[PDB]
Design a protein around this ligand. Structure first.
Ligand SMILES: Oc1cccc(Cl)c1Cl
Ligand SMILES: Oc1cccc(Cl)c1Cl
Lengths: 169, 169
């Protein structure tokens, strides 16, 4: 009954470390896709929401260099996203007085109101997405991911990042 | 000595489910950045390598729709990447005989040789990246990520994916 010579080939067995990269990539994609659709009426991408969040931790105002240091993304990516947010009335850029060529970036009241709304929806989205894993699995998942982050980030970010020390209770 | 009113505000404490999304995003970014630089002399992005890998599991030849079903990414993304790979001599597209408007996609010998090389480097890269977590932590990390994937993928992919059943030993 079973056809011959059709079954998976050797490229379907991976080193476990390679399978973990596949698993990270797939989870990142499936969560982002579902979250992005729930948040469509606020017009946010995951990176725009990240930048709103980071600026909120910085009190709503900062400079491109301080923001870039606090967040994982590349500075050129961050500057492109910030310009798009500026176009959309989310970010106000002002020439620092006297400090020539230095820019200040500030969330508008619209951005802050959007962040309010998007944070409350996002909490609900991530909680329903992760309801199938236990509190203990969640704690361990953050510990292992944090180890991976701490061992890999310095391979290409040499003192250029001081990532926001997020906590949970 | 310690300055007042300067310390993190309430946006630096997250729900654990939100912190896990931050942790997934950060690990995905730090691993991709370091891997992409090691693989620069083959000119591969993580998605191009993924598409080479998936086509290798399919025996080097397939159609855009079968490839799209096997892989996590959106079909329009996959088609853009495939066209870029075609430009680079990695993919050959041929009009199916008689089956009008149907396309076959096939890895060139150059692509297959590149995949060979990139797979061997990638195994070494992911292993050195993950040497700080144990075999048991790695096994559990894949199990938890797999649960997250299985609960979230169907929120936006309704029977449209039959993901490649990758194994490890
Ligand atoms: O830096 C962040 C803040 C909130 C969400 C996310 Cl994904 C990130 Cl990377
Ligand atoms: O589908 C895949 C095959 C190899 C590597 C990766 Cl990241 C993916 Cl998503």
């Amino acid at each position: 009954l079973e056809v011959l010579f059709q079954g998976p080939n050797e490229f379907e067995t991976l080193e476990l470390e390679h399978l973990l990269w596949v698993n990270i990539t797939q989870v990142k994609h499936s969560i982002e896709r579902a979250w992005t659709r729930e948040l469509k009426s606020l017009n946010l991408s995951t990176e725009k929401f990240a930048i709103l969040h980071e600026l909120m931790c910085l009190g709503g105002e900062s400079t491109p260099h301080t923001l870039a240091r606090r967040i994982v993304f590349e500075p050129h990516s961050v500057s492109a996203i910030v310009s798009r947010m500026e176009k959309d009335g989310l970010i106000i850029k002002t020439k620092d007085l006297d400090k020539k060529h230095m820019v200040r970036i500030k969330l508008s009241e619209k951005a802050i109101d959007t962040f309010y709304q998007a944070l409350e929806i996002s909490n609900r989205v991530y909680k329903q997405m992760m309801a199938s894993i236990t509190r203990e699995e969640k704690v361990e998942l953050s510990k292992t991911l944090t180890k991976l982050r701490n061992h890999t980030l310095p391979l290409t970010h040499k003192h250029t990042k001081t990532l926001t020390p997020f906590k949970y209770i």
